[PDB]
PDB file of C-alpha atoms (C1' of nucleotides) in Angstrom:
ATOM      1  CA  UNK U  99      52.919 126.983-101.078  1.00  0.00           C
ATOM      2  CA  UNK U 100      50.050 125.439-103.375  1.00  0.00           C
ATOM      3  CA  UNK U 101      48.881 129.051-103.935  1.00  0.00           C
ATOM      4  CA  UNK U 102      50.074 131.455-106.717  1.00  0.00           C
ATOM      5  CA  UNK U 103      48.458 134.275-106.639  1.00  0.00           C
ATOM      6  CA  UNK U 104      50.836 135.316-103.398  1.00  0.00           C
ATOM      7  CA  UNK U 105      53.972 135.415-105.258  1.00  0.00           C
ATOM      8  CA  UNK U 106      52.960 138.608-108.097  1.00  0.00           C
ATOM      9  CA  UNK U 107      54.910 140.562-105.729  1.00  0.00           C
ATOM     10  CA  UNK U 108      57.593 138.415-104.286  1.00  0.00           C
ATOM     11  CA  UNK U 109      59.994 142.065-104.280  1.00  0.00           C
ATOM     12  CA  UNK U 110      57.902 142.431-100.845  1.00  0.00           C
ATOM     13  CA  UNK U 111      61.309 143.509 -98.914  1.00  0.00           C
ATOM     14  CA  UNK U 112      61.129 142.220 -95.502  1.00  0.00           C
ATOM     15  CA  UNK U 113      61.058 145.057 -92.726  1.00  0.00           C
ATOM     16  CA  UNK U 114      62.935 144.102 -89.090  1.00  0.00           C
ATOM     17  CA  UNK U 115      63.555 145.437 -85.840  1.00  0.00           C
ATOM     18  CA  UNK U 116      67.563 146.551 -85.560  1.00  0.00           C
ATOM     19  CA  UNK U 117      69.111 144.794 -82.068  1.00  0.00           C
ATOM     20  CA  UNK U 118      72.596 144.896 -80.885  1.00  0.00           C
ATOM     21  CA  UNK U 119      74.312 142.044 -79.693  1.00  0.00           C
ATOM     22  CA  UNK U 120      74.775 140.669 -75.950  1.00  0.00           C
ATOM     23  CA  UNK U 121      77.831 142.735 -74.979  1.00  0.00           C
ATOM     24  CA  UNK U 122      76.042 146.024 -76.315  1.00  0.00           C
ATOM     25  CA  UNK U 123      72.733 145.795 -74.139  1.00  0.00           C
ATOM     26  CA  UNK U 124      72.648 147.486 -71.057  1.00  0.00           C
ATOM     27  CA  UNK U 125      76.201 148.054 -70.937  1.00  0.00           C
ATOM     28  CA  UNK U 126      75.995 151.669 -69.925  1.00  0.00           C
ATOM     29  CA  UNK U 127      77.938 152.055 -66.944  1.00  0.00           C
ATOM     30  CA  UNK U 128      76.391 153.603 -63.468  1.00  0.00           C
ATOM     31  CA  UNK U 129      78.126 154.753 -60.480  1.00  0.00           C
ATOM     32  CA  UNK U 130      79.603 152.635 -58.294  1.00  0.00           C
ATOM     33  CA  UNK U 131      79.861 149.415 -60.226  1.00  0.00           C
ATOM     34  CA  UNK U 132      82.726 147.880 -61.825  1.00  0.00           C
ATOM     35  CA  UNK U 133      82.945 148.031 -65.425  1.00  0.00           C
ATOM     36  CA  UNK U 134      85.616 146.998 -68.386  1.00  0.00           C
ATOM     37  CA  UNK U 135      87.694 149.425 -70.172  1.00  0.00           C
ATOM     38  CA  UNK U 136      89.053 148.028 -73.443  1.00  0.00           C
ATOM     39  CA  UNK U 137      92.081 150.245 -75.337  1.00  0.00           C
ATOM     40  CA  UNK U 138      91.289 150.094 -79.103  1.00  0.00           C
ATOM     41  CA  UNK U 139      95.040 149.151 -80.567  1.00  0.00           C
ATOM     42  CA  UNK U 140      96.086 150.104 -84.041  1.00  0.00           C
ATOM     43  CA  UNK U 141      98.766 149.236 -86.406  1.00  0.00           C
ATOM     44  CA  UNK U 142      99.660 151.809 -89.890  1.00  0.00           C
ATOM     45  CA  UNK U 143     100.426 149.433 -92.745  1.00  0.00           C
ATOM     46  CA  UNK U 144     101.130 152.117 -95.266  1.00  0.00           C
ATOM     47  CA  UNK U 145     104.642 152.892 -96.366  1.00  0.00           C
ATOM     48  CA  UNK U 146     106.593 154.962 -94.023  1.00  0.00           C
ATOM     49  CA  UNK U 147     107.486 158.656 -96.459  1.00  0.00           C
TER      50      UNK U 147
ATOM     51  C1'   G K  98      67.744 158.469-109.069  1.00  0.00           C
ATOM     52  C1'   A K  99      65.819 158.658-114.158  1.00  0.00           C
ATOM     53  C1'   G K 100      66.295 155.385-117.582  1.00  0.00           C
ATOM     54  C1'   A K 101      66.920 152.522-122.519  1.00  0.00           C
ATOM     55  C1'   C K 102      69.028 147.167-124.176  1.00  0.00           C
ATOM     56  C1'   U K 103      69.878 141.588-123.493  1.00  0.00           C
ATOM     57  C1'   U K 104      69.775 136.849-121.500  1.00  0.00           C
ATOM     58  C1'   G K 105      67.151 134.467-117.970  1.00  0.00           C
ATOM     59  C1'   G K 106      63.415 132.428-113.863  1.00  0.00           C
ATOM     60  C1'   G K 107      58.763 132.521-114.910  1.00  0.00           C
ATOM     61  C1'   C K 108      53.339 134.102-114.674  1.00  0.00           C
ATOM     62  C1'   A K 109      49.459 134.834-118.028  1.00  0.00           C
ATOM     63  C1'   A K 110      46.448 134.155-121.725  1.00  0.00           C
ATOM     64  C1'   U K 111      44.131 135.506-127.497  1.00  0.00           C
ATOM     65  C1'   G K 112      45.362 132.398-131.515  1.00  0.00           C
ATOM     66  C1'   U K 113      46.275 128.457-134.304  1.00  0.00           C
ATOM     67  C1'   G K 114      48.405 124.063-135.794  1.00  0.00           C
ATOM     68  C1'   A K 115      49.610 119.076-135.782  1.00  0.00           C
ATOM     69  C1'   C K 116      50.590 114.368-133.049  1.00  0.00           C
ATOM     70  C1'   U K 117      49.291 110.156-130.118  1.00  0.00           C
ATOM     71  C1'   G K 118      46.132 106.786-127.439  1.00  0.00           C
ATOM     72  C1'   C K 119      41.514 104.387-126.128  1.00  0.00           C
ATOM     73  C1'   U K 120      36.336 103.138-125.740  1.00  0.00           C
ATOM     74  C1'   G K 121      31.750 101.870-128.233  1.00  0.00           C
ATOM     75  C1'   A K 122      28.517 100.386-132.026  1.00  0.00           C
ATOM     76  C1'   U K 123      27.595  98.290-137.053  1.00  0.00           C
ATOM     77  C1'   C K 124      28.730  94.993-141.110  1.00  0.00           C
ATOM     78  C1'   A K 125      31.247  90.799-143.403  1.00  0.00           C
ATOM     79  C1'   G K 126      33.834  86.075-143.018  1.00  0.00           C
ATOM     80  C1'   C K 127      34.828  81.916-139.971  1.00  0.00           C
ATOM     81  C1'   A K 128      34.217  78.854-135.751  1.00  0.00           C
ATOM     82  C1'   G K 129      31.333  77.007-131.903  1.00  0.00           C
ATOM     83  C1'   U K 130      26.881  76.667-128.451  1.00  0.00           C
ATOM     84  C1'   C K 131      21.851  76.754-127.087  1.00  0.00           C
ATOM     85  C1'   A K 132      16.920  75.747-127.784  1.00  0.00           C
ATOM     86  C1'   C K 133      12.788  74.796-131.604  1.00  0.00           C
ATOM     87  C1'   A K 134      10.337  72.821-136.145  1.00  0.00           C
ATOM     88  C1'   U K 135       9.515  68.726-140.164  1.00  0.00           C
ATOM     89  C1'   U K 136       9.479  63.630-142.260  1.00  0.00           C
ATOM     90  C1'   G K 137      10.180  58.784-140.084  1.00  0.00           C
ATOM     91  C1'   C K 138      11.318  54.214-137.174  1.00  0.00           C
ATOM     92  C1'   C K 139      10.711  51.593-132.681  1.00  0.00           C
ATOM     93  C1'   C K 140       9.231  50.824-127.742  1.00  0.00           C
ATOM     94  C1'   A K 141       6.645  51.414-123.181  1.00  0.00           C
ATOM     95  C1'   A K 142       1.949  51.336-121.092  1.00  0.00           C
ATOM     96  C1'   G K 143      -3.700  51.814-119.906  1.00  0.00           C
ATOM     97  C1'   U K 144      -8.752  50.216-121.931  1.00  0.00           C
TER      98        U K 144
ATOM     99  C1'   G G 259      -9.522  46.447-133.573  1.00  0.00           C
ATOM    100  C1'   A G 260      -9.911  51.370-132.463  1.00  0.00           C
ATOM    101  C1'   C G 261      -8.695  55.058-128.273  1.00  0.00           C
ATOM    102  C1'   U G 262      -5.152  57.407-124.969  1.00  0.00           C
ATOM    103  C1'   U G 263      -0.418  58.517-122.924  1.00  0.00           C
ATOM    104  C1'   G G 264       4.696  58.448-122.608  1.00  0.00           C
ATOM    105  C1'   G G 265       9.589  57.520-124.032  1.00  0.00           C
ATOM    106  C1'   G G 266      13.695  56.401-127.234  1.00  0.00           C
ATOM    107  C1'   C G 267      16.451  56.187-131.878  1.00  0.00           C
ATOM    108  C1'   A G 268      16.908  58.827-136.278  1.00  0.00           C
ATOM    109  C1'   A G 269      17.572  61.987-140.251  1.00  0.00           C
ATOM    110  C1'   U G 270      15.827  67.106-142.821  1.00  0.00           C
ATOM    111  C1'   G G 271      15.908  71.852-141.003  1.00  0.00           C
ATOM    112  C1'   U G 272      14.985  76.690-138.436  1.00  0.00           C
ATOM    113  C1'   G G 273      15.655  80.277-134.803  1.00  0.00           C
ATOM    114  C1'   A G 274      19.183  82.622-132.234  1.00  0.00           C
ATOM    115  C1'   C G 275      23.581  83.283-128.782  1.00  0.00           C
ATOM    116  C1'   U G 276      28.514  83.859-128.074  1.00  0.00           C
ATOM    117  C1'   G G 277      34.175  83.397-129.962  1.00  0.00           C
ATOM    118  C1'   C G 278      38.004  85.003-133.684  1.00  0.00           C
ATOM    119  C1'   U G 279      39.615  88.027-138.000  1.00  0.00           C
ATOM    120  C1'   G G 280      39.021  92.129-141.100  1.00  0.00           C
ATOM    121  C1'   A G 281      36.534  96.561-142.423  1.00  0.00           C
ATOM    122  C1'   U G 282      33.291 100.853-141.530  1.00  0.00           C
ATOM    123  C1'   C G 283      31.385 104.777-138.171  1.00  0.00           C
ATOM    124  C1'   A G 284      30.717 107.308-133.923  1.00  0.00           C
ATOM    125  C1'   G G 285      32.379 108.437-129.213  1.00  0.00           C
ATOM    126  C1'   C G 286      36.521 110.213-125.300  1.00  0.00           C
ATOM    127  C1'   A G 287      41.482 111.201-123.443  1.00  0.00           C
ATOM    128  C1'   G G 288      46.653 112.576-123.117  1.00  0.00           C
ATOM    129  C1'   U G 289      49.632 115.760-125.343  1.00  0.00           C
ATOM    130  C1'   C G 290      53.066 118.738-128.293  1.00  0.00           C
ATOM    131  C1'   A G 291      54.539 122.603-131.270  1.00  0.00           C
ATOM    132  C1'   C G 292      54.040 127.500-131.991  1.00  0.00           C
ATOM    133  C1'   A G 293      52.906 133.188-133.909  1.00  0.00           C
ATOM    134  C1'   U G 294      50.650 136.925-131.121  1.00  0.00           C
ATOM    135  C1'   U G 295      50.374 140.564-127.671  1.00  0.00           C
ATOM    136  C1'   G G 296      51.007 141.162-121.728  1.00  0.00           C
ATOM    137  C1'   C G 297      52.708 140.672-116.080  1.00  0.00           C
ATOM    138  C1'   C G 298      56.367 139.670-111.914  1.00  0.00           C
ATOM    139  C1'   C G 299      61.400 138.592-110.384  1.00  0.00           C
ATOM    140  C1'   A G 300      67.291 137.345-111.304  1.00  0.00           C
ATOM    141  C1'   A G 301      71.756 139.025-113.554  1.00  0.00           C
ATOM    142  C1'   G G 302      73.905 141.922-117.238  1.00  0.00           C
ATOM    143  C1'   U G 303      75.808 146.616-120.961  1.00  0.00           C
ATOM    144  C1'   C G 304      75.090 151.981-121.661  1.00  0.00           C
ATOM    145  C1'   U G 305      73.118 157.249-121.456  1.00  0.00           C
ATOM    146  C1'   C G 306      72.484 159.993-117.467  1.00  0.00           C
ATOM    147  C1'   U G 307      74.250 160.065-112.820  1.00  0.00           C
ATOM    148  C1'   U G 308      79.135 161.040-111.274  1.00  0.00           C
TER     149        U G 308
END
RNA sequence: GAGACUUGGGCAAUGUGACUGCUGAUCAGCAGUCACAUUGCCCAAGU
RNA sequence: GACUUGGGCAAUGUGACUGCUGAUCAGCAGUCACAUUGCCCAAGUCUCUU
């Protein structure tokens, strides 16, 4: 922090690994086990015409 | 994306300008302290 | 009666040393303002983009 030289180019954008969360690791199913099945429900708002 | 324009957060310096504060030495005046010199007086002794 | 030594009381001075005031001069420091041209970010308006 006592330097200042190291901030002339602060727009240094940061570059990171993507991960997916806990529920989307290793959730491929494989034969023979017991997986979930989760039905995506959906509700039209718009005006009825 | 290419850009122009403005306020910002700043980073720099090239200037330049003025402000403020302090130390030290010297001189002068005054006050006071150390020693020293001069003219006396008197005393203490010894021979 | 000379000779010697020492001390004390005086006055008349001198040599300096500090203390205070004022003045003079040299010597340092902390700043501040501000024109000039530069650099990196933040958010804006517009051409274009669309």
């Amino acid at each position: 922090v006592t330097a200042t030289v190291n901030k002339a180019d602060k727009s240094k954008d940061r570059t990171y690994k993507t991960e997916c969360p806990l529920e989307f690791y290793d959730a491929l199913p494989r034969v023979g086990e017991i997986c979930y099945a989760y039905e995506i429900f959906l509700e039209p708002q718009f005006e009825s015409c």
